[PDB]
Write a protein that binds this ligand. Structure first.
Ligand SMILES: *[C@@H]1O[C@H](CO)[C@@H](O[C@@H]2O[C@H](CO)[C@@H](O)[C@H](O)[C@H]2NC(C)=O)[C@H](O)[C@H]1NC(C)=O
Length: 246
Protein backbone atom coordinates (compact mmCIF):
# COMPACT_ATOMS: atom_id res chain seq x y z
CA UNK A 1 0.00 0.00 0.00
CA UNK A 2 1.04 3.67 -0.28
CA UNK A 3 -0.19 6.61 1.76
CA UNK A 4 -0.40 10.41 1.59
CA UNK A 5 -1.42 12.87 4.33
CA UNK A 6 -2.69 16.33 3.50
CA UNK A 7 -2.01 17.56 7.05
CA UNK A 8 1.49 19.19 6.99
CA UNK A 9 1.77 18.31 3.17
CA UNK A 10 4.17 20.22 0.98
CA UNK A 11 5.89 19.80 -2.31
CA UNK A 12 8.49 17.49 -0.86
CA UNK A 13 6.03 15.17 0.88
CA UNK A 14 3.79 15.07 -2.24
CA UNK A 15 6.84 14.16 -4.36
CA UNK A 16 7.62 11.29 -1.85
CA UNK A 17 4.04 10.03 -2.28
CA UNK A 18 4.23 10.13 -6.13
CA UNK A 19 7.57 8.33 -5.81
CA UNK A 20 6.01 5.63 -3.58
CA UNK A 21 3.08 5.30 -6.01
CA UNK A 22 5.34 4.78 -9.05
CA UNK A 23 7.54 2.28 -7.10
CA UNK A 24 4.50 0.29 -6.01
CA UNK A 25 3.66 -0.63 -9.60
CA UNK A 26 5.37 -3.83 -10.77
CA UNK A 27 7.43 -4.11 -14.02
CA UNK A 28 9.82 -6.76 -15.30
CA UNK A 29 11.25 -4.63 -18.17
CA UNK A 30 12.08 -0.99 -19.08
CA UNK A 31 11.64 0.40 -22.61
CA UNK A 32 13.91 3.29 -23.33
CA UNK A 33 14.64 3.35 -19.59
CA UNK A 34 10.90 3.88 -18.69
CA UNK A 35 9.19 1.11 -16.63
CA UNK A 36 6.81 -1.03 -18.75
CA UNK A 37 3.68 -1.94 -16.83
CA UNK A 38 2.60 -5.62 -16.86
CA UNK A 39 0.20 -7.06 -19.44
CA UNK A 40 -1.87 -8.55 -16.57
CA UNK A 41 -1.78 -9.56 -12.91
CA UNK A 42 -3.95 -12.33 -11.51
CA UNK A 43 -6.21 -11.99 -8.50
CA UNK A 44 -5.95 -9.48 -5.70
CA UNK A 45 -2.35 -8.51 -6.58
CA UNK A 46 -3.77 -6.55 -9.52
CA UNK A 47 -4.85 -3.78 -7.10
CA UNK A 48 -2.79 -1.31 -5.22
CA UNK A 49 -4.36 0.41 -2.17
CA UNK A 50 -3.68 4.13 -1.69
CA UNK A 51 -4.53 5.49 1.72
CA UNK A 52 -5.34 9.17 1.54
CA UNK A 53 -5.91 11.43 4.58
CA UNK A 54 -7.51 14.84 4.46
CA UNK A 55 -6.26 17.68 6.53
CA UNK A 56 -8.50 16.60 9.41
CA UNK A 57 -7.14 13.06 9.39
CA UNK A 58 -10.18 11.42 7.82
CA UNK A 59 -9.34 8.80 5.29
CA UNK A 60 -10.37 6.94 2.18
CA UNK A 61 -8.64 4.00 0.57
CA UNK A 62 -8.43 4.02 -3.20
CA UNK A 63 -8.01 0.82 -5.32
CA UNK A 64 -5.71 1.25 -8.36
CA UNK A 65 -5.25 -1.33 -11.12
CA UNK A 66 -1.44 -1.77 -11.32
CA UNK A 67 -1.42 -2.69 -15.03
CA UNK A 68 -2.85 0.68 -16.06
CA UNK A 69 -2.95 3.03 -13.04
CA UNK A 70 -6.73 3.21 -13.40
CA UNK A 71 -8.62 3.97 -10.26
CA UNK A 72 -11.34 1.31 -9.82
CA UNK A 73 -13.09 2.41 -6.62
CA UNK A 74 -12.55 3.45 -3.05
CA UNK A 75 -13.64 2.70 0.48
CA UNK A 76 -14.88 5.43 2.83
CA UNK A 77 -15.63 4.27 6.36
CA UNK A 78 -17.88 1.22 5.99
CA UNK A 79 -19.04 1.84 2.42
CA UNK A 80 -17.26 0.90 -0.85
CA UNK A 81 -17.82 2.66 -4.16
CA UNK A 82 -16.92 1.39 -7.65
CA UNK A 83 -17.23 2.78 -11.13
CA UNK A 84 -19.99 1.31 -13.30
CA UNK A 85 -17.76 -0.70 -15.65
CA UNK A 86 -16.72 -4.27 -15.98
CA UNK A 87 -13.12 -3.73 -14.78
CA UNK A 88 -14.39 -2.09 -11.58
CA UNK A 89 -16.98 -4.79 -10.96
CA UNK A 90 -14.14 -7.34 -11.23
CA UNK A 91 -12.08 -5.29 -8.75
CA UNK A 92 -15.04 -5.41 -6.32
CA UNK A 93 -14.54 -9.18 -6.15
CA UNK A 94 -11.14 -8.57 -4.62
CA UNK A 95 -10.92 -5.32 -2.57
CA UNK A 96 -12.99 -3.78 0.28
CA UNK A 97 -15.09 -6.96 0.56
CA UNK A 98 -15.45 -6.16 4.30
CA UNK A 99 -17.51 -2.98 3.50
CA UNK A 100 -20.94 -3.19 5.06
CA UNK A 101 -22.44 -1.95 1.75
CA UNK A 102 -21.20 -1.44 -1.81
CA UNK A 103 -22.48 1.40 -4.03
CA UNK A 104 -21.89 1.30 -7.75
CA UNK A 105 -21.34 4.84 -8.94
CA UNK A 106 -23.65 5.95 -11.72
CA UNK A 107 -20.88 6.39 -14.29
CA UNK A 108 -17.74 4.70 -15.51
CA UNK A 109 -14.30 6.08 -14.56
CA UNK A 110 -13.44 7.64 -17.91
CA UNK A 111 -12.87 11.31 -18.32
CA UNK A 112 -15.67 11.80 -20.82
CA UNK A 113 -18.28 10.21 -18.48
CA UNK A 114 -16.92 11.85 -15.33
CA UNK A 115 -17.04 15.34 -16.98
CA UNK A 116 -20.61 14.77 -18.10
CA UNK A 117 -21.54 13.68 -14.47
CA UNK A 118 -19.68 16.64 -12.95
CA UNK A 119 -21.16 19.15 -15.40
CA UNK A 120 -17.80 20.63 -16.44
CA UNK A 121 -14.71 19.68 -18.47
CA UNK A 122 -11.59 19.33 -16.52
CA UNK A 123 -10.22 22.50 -18.24
CA UNK A 124 -12.45 24.25 -15.74
CA UNK A 125 -11.82 22.29 -12.51
CA UNK A 126 -8.94 23.60 -10.39
CA UNK A 127 -6.44 21.05 -9.17
CA UNK A 128 -3.70 21.13 -6.59
CA UNK A 129 -3.26 19.94 -2.95
CA UNK A 130 -6.03 21.97 -1.53
CA UNK A 131 -8.38 20.52 -4.28
CA UNK A 132 -7.19 17.02 -3.28
CA UNK A 133 -8.02 17.68 0.31
CA UNK A 134 -11.51 18.77 -0.75
CA UNK A 135 -11.87 15.72 -3.00
CA UNK A 136 -11.02 13.29 -0.15
CA UNK A 137 -13.55 15.14 1.99
CA UNK A 138 -16.26 14.95 -0.69
CA UNK A 139 -15.79 11.24 -1.21
CA UNK A 140 -16.29 10.51 2.54
CA UNK A 141 -20.04 10.89 2.07
CA UNK A 142 -21.92 9.81 -0.92
CA UNK A 143 -23.05 12.43 -3.46
CA UNK A 144 -22.65 11.22 -7.05
CA UNK A 145 -22.54 14.63 -8.78
CA UNK A 146 -19.99 16.08 -6.22
CA UNK A 147 -18.05 12.81 -6.36
CA UNK A 148 -17.51 12.99 -10.17
CA UNK A 149 -15.60 16.27 -9.81
CA UNK A 150 -13.74 15.01 -6.71
CA UNK A 151 -12.72 11.98 -8.75
CA UNK A 152 -11.48 14.18 -11.68
CA UNK A 153 -9.28 15.93 -9.09
CA UNK A 154 -8.17 12.65 -7.50
CA UNK A 155 -7.30 10.88 -10.77
CA UNK A 156 -5.14 13.79 -11.98
CA UNK A 157 -3.34 14.56 -8.63
CA UNK A 158 -2.42 10.81 -8.04
CA UNK A 159 -2.42 8.59 -11.32
CA UNK A 160 -1.57 11.29 -13.81
CA UNK A 161 1.22 12.80 -11.71
CA UNK A 162 2.63 9.23 -11.28
CA UNK A 163 2.62 8.92 -15.17
CA UNK A 164 4.27 12.27 -16.03
CA UNK A 165 6.90 14.19 -14.16
CA UNK A 166 5.51 17.47 -15.73
CA UNK A 167 2.08 16.78 -14.05
CA UNK A 168 3.71 15.96 -10.73
CA UNK A 169 5.55 19.33 -10.90
CA UNK A 170 2.31 21.13 -11.88
CA UNK A 171 0.68 19.78 -8.67
CA UNK A 172 3.73 20.77 -6.59
CA UNK A 173 3.33 24.35 -7.99
CA UNK A 174 -0.28 24.14 -6.71
CA UNK A 175 0.60 22.96 -3.14
CA UNK A 176 -1.12 25.92 -1.45
CA UNK A 177 -3.24 27.38 -4.29
CA UNK A 178 -5.32 25.42 -6.81
CA UNK A 179 -5.34 26.26 -10.47
CA UNK A 180 -6.97 24.65 -13.55
CA UNK A 181 -4.54 22.23 -15.30
CA UNK A 182 -2.40 23.75 -18.10
CA UNK A 183 -3.43 22.65 -21.58
CA UNK A 184 -0.08 20.73 -21.72
CA UNK A 185 -1.32 18.72 -18.66
CA UNK A 186 -4.62 17.85 -20.41
CA UNK A 187 -2.78 16.91 -23.65
CA UNK A 188 -0.40 14.54 -21.76
CA UNK A 189 -3.31 12.89 -19.96
CA UNK A 190 -5.16 12.36 -23.23
CA UNK A 191 -1.96 11.06 -24.90
CA UNK A 192 -0.69 8.54 -22.40
CA UNK A 193 -1.91 5.47 -24.22
CA UNK A 194 -0.72 6.80 -27.65
CA UNK A 195 2.71 7.76 -26.21
CA UNK A 196 3.02 4.41 -24.36
CA UNK A 197 2.25 2.56 -27.63
CA UNK A 198 4.62 4.65 -29.83
CA UNK A 199 7.52 4.29 -27.32
CA UNK A 200 7.12 0.54 -27.47
CA UNK A 201 6.76 0.44 -31.36
CA UNK A 202 9.96 2.55 -31.56
CA UNK A 203 11.88 -0.48 -30.01
CA UNK A 204 12.05 -2.24 -33.41
CA UNK A 205 11.98 0.91 -35.53
CA UNK A 206 15.32 2.53 -34.48
CA UNK A 207 13.76 4.83 -31.91
CA UNK A 208 11.26 6.31 -34.41
CA UNK A 209 7.47 6.34 -33.69
CA UNK A 210 5.36 4.48 -36.25
CA UNK A 211 2.78 7.29 -35.95
CA UNK A 212 3.62 10.75 -34.52
CA UNK A 213 1.93 11.98 -31.36
CA UNK A 214 0.56 15.54 -31.18
CA UNK A 215 0.99 17.42 -27.83
CA UNK A 216 0.45 20.94 -26.50
CA UNK A 217 3.69 22.32 -25.00
CA UNK A 218 4.17 24.60 -21.92
CA UNK A 219 3.77 27.59 -24.20
CA UNK A 220 0.34 26.42 -25.41
CA UNK A 221 1.72 25.44 -28.87
CA UNK A 222 0.86 22.13 -30.59
CA UNK A 223 3.95 19.98 -31.23
CA UNK A 224 4.58 16.74 -33.12
CA UNK A 225 6.52 14.00 -31.18
CA UNK A 226 8.12 11.62 -33.72
CA UNK A 227 10.89 9.76 -31.89
CA UNK A 228 12.40 8.76 -28.51
CA UNK A 229 14.84 11.66 -28.33
CA UNK A 230 11.93 14.00 -27.37
CA UNK A 231 12.04 15.52 -23.85
CA UNK A 232 8.55 13.94 -23.44
CA UNK A 233 10.20 10.48 -23.62
CA UNK A 234 13.63 11.18 -22.08
CA UNK A 235 12.47 13.27 -19.16
CA UNK A 236 8.69 13.42 -18.67
CA UNK A 237 6.84 10.06 -19.06
CA UNK A 238 7.45 7.69 -16.03
CA UNK A 239 5.28 4.60 -16.80
CA UNK A 240 4.24 2.87 -20.05
CA UNK A 241 0.85 1.26 -20.59
CA UNK A 242 1.71 -2.17 -22.02
CA UNK A 243 0.64 -2.43 -25.76
CA UNK A 244 -1.10 -5.69 -24.80
CA UNK A 245 -3.65 -3.37 -23.07
CA UNK A 246 -4.00 -0.94 -25.96
C1 LIG B 1 13.47 13.34 -33.53
O1 LIG B 1 12.90 14.34 -32.73
C2 LIG B 1 13.56 15.59 -32.75
C3 LIG B 1 12.72 16.51 -31.89
O2 LIG B 1 12.76 16.04 -30.57
C4 LIG B 1 13.69 16.20 -34.15
O3 LIG B 1 14.51 17.36 -34.18
C5 LIG B 1 13.71 18.59 -34.08
O4 LIG B 1 12.79 18.92 -35.14
C6 LIG B 1 13.08 20.04 -36.00
C7 LIG B 1 14.32 19.83 -36.93
O5 LIG B 1 14.20 18.74 -37.85
C8 LIG B 1 13.11 21.33 -35.13
O6 LIG B 1 11.84 21.94 -35.16
C9 LIG B 1 13.48 21.04 -33.66
O7 LIG B 1 14.02 22.19 -33.03
C10 LIG B 1 14.46 19.85 -33.57
N1 LIG B 1 15.06 19.78 -32.23
C11 LIG B 1 16.26 19.25 -31.93
C12 LIG B 1 16.64 19.32 -30.48
O8 LIG B 1 17.02 18.72 -32.73
C13 LIG B 1 14.29 15.21 -35.13
O9 LIG B 1 14.18 15.80 -36.43
C14 LIG B 1 13.63 13.82 -34.98
N2 LIG B 1 14.35 12.77 -35.71
C15 LIG B 1 13.70 11.87 -36.48
C16 LIG B 1 14.60 10.86 -37.15
O10 LIG B 1 12.46 11.82 -36.65
Amino acid sequence: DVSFRLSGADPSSYGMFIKDLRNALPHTEKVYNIPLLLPSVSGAGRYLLMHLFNYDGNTITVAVDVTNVYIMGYLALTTSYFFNEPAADLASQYVFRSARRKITLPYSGNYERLQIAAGKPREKIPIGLPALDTAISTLLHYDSTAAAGALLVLIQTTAEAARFKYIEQQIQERAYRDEVPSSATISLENSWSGLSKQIQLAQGNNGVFRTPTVLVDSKGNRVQITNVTSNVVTSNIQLLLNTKNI
